[PDB]
Design an enzyme around this catalytic site. Structure first.
Site, PDB file in Angstrom:
ATOM      1  N   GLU A 158     -19.172  11.877 -10.015  1.00  0.00           N
ATOM      2  CA  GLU A 158     -18.927  12.193 -11.549  1.00  0.00           C
ATOM      3  C   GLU A 158     -18.905  13.477 -11.862  1.00  0.00           C
ATOM      4  OE1 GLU A 158     -14.416  11.272 -10.454  1.00  0.00           O
ATOM      5  OE2 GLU A 158     -15.060  11.064  -8.165  1.00  0.00           O
ATOM      6  N   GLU A 234     -17.166   8.183  -2.583  1.00  0.00           N
ATOM      7  CA  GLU A 234     -15.723   7.212  -3.002  1.00  0.00           C
ATOM      8  C   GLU A 234     -14.590   7.412  -2.364  1.00  0.00           C
ATOM      9  OE1 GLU A 234     -16.449   6.464  -7.329  1.00  0.00           O
ATOM     10  OE2 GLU A 234     -14.087   7.234  -7.697  1.00  0.00           O
TER      11      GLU A 234
HETATM   12  O1  LIG Z   1      -9.310   7.392  -8.577  1.00  0.00           O
HETATM   13  C1  LIG Z   1     -10.031   6.472  -9.429  1.00  0.00           C
HETATM   14  C2  LIG Z   1     -11.393   6.555  -9.101  1.00  0.00           C
HETATM   15  O2  LIG Z   1     -11.963   8.172  -9.455  1.00  0.00           O
HETATM   16  C3  LIG Z   1     -13.467   8.656  -9.090  1.00  0.00           C
HETATM   17  O3  LIG Z   1     -13.249   9.483  -9.529  1.00  0.00           O
HETATM   18  C4  LIG Z   1     -14.316   7.602  -9.747  1.00  0.00           C
HETATM   19  O4  LIG Z   1     -15.528   7.237  -9.860  1.00  0.00           O
HETATM   20  C5  LIG Z   1     -13.670   6.080  -9.708  1.00  0.00           C
HETATM   21  O5  LIG Z   1     -14.479   4.838 -10.906  1.00  0.00           O
HETATM   22  C6  LIG Z   1     -12.319   5.965 -10.082  1.00  0.00           C
HETATM   23  O6  LIG Z   1     -12.192   6.095 -11.576  1.00  0.00           O
END
Ligand SMILES: OC[C@H]1O[C@@H](O)[C@H](O)[C@@H](O)[C@H]1O
Ligand SMILES: *[C@@H]1O[C@H](CO)[C@@H](O[C@@H]2O[C@H](CO)[C@@H](O[C@@H]3O[C@H](CO)[C@@H](O)[C@H](O)[C@@H]3O)[C@H](O)[C@H]2NC(C)=O)[C@H](O)[C@H]1NC(C)=O
Ligand SMILES: *[C@@H]1O[C@H](CO)[C@@H](O[C@@H]2O[C@H](CO)[C@@H](O)[C@H](O)[C@H]2NC(C)=O)[C@H](O)[C@H]1NC(C)=O
Ligand SMILES: *[C@@H]1O[C@H](CO)[C@@H](O)[C@H](O)[C@H]1NC(C)=O
Ligand SMILES: *[C@@H]1O[C@H](CO)[C@@H](O)[C@H](O)[C@H]1NC(C)=O
Ligand SMILES: [Ca+2]
Length: 641
Positions: A158, A234
């Site tokens: 990110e 993710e």
């Molecule tokens: O929603 C929470 C998640 O959000 C993403 O942006 C991140 O890669 C994760 O580590 C976690 O923080």
């Protein structure tokens, strides 16, 4: 009304797998000290084939010593010239996963990096070859120390990518005989990675997968043009209540249907972090009490099963997938060996809200669905049937086989809201079961750790969740009274992902604790300028670690002490002079009851009845004033919840 499933016209995209993330950050922290057999059962529920979630893919953080959402994770290179392939728990987790599923696909991604890679800047692209070298050591290590083959390497979670970095990283992987390892980018939004790939053939050659985050089931035109595999690399991140299992179910299907995504990976694998940390309980199951052995096999484990037990990476989607007339969706897949799997979902807007993004309302209602098998499918007469109903729930119940012996190659279903059906030729399906584990219990109200372990199985003491800096078991042969201690090992701020605190800190215990006494031996390694503390009522961690309030009791090697209301040190409760220097063992005691606190240096009162905010509650904690070496020993806490 009627929906056709067919393959005579060709096949959809290749299916790549369903998976989950351990990391970003310290999400698996509290899983390592589960007693047996529970720890092993938990792992089985996640990884054992034909059992529970039966995951195809395991994605793990490559620790960079920075805070990365629910703690820090230790790097394999804390300093220049340091290489250690045994810190933290991702190596372990990967091995446990390969034990249960030899074919599991493994992925690594950095979130933060050690500060020394920045060469004087908090930036991982100052020296591309150095950052690639770092990342490639990790892949080599996985193989050389754990016999792990890493299948996919990412860029910077990110955060911006640098196209020259991706090219270097490819050249570097190749140079080390890692041609086999594939690259996924950029683990952020669809752009600028997608357009970058259309404009630069050299970049196109070296990126194998476009992995995007929290895409809301959709892709964008440039990604489709690229011809790359597209993954929700993710997604999820929602409380594993029924709502979350609903969210997971819907996006499992609609990520392919709407966004042409051939894999989806949930953050996070299992909730093994204190619930009051950010995004608590947002794993596919819950395991947040190593002291009791208690774990919850939450709804999302069975939602996963509905796809994972009946598909494998390498199967293909059919061209015929879509939405249902009256709400919800359906996908279907084959292995090209005569097997067919059909997954149907009817999640209602109200019971399927993901955290990112929020969906405008949509309607779902009772409907009949008729399916007809044309092409090479007509020849199917029998289909096993699996069924889940979310909200009083029934999970992953096997139902009586459905027969199409009439020769119609057709059948029909009474679908209602919030249901899932899996119809499959495969007969391997199983709702794995272990007996219920022990009942939940608060963190112990008396608790001690003297760190006396000569060959620890993990690099850090149990239950201590680092939220800035990195704390490690430490053996010091040259002292006999303190031969085994816990040591803060960072000497400089990491290239951060989150806003790490200015001070290091590790939190422990029960967030509800309100009256408590915390004692610890502390040793400050830096002369003149060093400082350490112990605390209680610490109320925030993770992403928010900078915000933490509580009662913080600091001593410094300049002969002084402060009591602050906050980790940032802005707010003073008491301050004064103390007989404290560097490189001497001191015992700190901190006692907090209702409105008042006191501190003792070496069993003797230093300050008494200092007024503090109340009510207030939170964890206990130890830490250091900056990123500086320090040690702790004979830790204890007595608390009232
Ligand atoms: O929603 C929470 C998640 O959000 C993403 O942006 C991140 O890669 C994760 O580590 C976690 O923080
Ligand atoms: C943590 O410590 C605080 C302070 O000691 C606790 O709050 C206190 O609770 C006690 C009893 O539960 C209160 O005692 C008083 O007793 C008399 C005589 O019977 C009664 O008439 C009073 O009305 C009162 O109940 C005390 O006022 C109260 N103190 C404050 C400042 O609120 C608290 O219970 C402890 N927390 C835990 C969960 O251990
Ligand atoms: C359906 O799936 C199985 C597994 O992919 C196919 O392969 C055979 O399955 C049995 C049971 O697992 C194995 O013991 C055999 O060794 C497998 N044979 C081969 C050559 O892999 C099977 O062919 C498929 N067909 C159907 C619809 O049953
Ligand atoms: C992606 O999905 C759309 C409909 O959602 C479909 O029409 C299109 O062919 C797919 N794009 C691909 C596979 O490139
Ligand atoms: C959703 O659609 C059904 C069927 O057409 C209808 O009966 C119901 O009133 C609708 N609900 C809302 C709130 O739109
Ligand atoms: Ca010791």
């Amino acid at each position: 009304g009627a929906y056709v499933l067919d393959d005579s016209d060709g096949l959809g995209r290749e299916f790549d797998g369903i998976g989950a993330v351990s990391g970003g950050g310290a999400t698996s922290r509290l899983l390592v000290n589960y007693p047996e057999p529970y720890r092993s059962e938990i792992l089985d529920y996640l990884f054992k084939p034909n059992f529970g979630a039966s995951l195809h893919i395991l994605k793990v953080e490559i620790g960079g010593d920075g805070q990365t959402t629910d703690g820090t994770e230790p790097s394999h290179m804390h300093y220049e010239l340091d290489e250690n392939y045994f810190r933290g728990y991702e190596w372990w987790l990967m091995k446990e996963a390969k034990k249960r599923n030899p074919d599991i696909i493994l992925m690594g991604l950095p979130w933060s990096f050690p500060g020394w890679l920045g060469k004087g800047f908090s930036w991982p692209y100052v020296n591309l070859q150095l950052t690639a070298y770092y990342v490639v050591r990790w892949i080599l290590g996985a193989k050389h120390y754990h016999d792990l083959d890493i299948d996919y390497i990412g860029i910077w979670n990110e955060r911006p990518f640098d196209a020259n970095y991706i090219k270097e990283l490819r050249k570097m992987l190749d140079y080390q005989g890692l041609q086999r390892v594939r690259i996924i980018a950029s683990d952020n939004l669809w752009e600028p990675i997608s357009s970058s790939l259309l404009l630069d053939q050299e970049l196109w050659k070296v990126v194998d997968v476009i992995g995007a985050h929290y895409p809301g089931t959709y892709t964008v035109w440039n990604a489709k043009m690229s011809g790359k595999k597209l993954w929700s690399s993710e997604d999820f991140s929602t409380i594993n209540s029924n709502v979350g299992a609903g969210c997971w179910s819907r996006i499992l299907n609609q990520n392919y249907i709407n966004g042409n995504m051939t894999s989806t990976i949930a953050w996070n694998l299992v909730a093994s972090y204190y619930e009051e940390l950010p995004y608590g309980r947002s794993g596919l199951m819950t395991a947040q009490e190593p002291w009791s052995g208690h774990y919850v096999v939450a709804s999302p484990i069975w939602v996963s099963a509905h796809t994972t037990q009946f598909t494998q990476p390498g199967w293909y989607y059919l061209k015929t997938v879509g939405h249902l007339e009256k709400g919800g969706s359906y996908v279907a897949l084959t292995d090209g060996l005569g097997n067919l799997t059909i997954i149907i979902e009817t999640m209602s807007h109200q019971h399927s809200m993901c955290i990112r993004p929020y969906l405008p309302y949509y309607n779902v209602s009772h409907q009949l669905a008729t399916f007809t098998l044309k092409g090479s499918l007509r020849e199917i007469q029998e289909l096993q049937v699996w069924y889940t109903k979310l909200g009083q729930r029934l999970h992953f119940k096997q139902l009586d086989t459905l027969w199409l012996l009439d020769g119609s190659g057709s059948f029909t279903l009474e679908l209602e809201e919030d249901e899932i059906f899996t119809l499959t030729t495969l007969t391997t399906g199983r709702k794995g079961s272990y007996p219920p584990p022990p009942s939940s219990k608060p963190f112990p109200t008396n608790y001690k750790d003297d760190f006396n372990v000569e060959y620890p199985l993990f690099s850090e003491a149990p239950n201590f969740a680092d939220q800035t800096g990195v704390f490690e078991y430490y053996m010091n042969n040259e002292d006999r009274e303190h031969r085994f201690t816990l040591r803060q090992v960072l000497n400089q701020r990491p290239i951060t992902w989150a806003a790490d605190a200015s001070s290091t800190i590790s939190v422990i215990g029960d967030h509800h604790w309100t009256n408590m006494t915390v004692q610890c031996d502390v040793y400050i390694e830096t002369p003149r300028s060093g400082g350490v503390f112990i605390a209680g009522r610490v109320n925030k961690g993770g992403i928010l670690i900078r915000s933490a309030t509580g009662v913080f009791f600091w001593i410094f090697a300049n002969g002084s002490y402060r009591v602050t209301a906050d980790l940032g040190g802005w707010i003073t409760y008491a301050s004064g002079h103390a007989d404290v220097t560097a490189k001497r063992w001191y015992t700190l005691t901190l006692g907090i009851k209702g409105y008042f606190a006191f501190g003792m240096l070496n069993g003797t009162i230093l300050w008494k009845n200092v007024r503090v905010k109340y009510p207030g509650h939170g964890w206990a904690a130890i830490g250091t004033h900056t990123f500086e070496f320090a040690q702790f020993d004979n830790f204890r806490v007595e608390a009232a919840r």
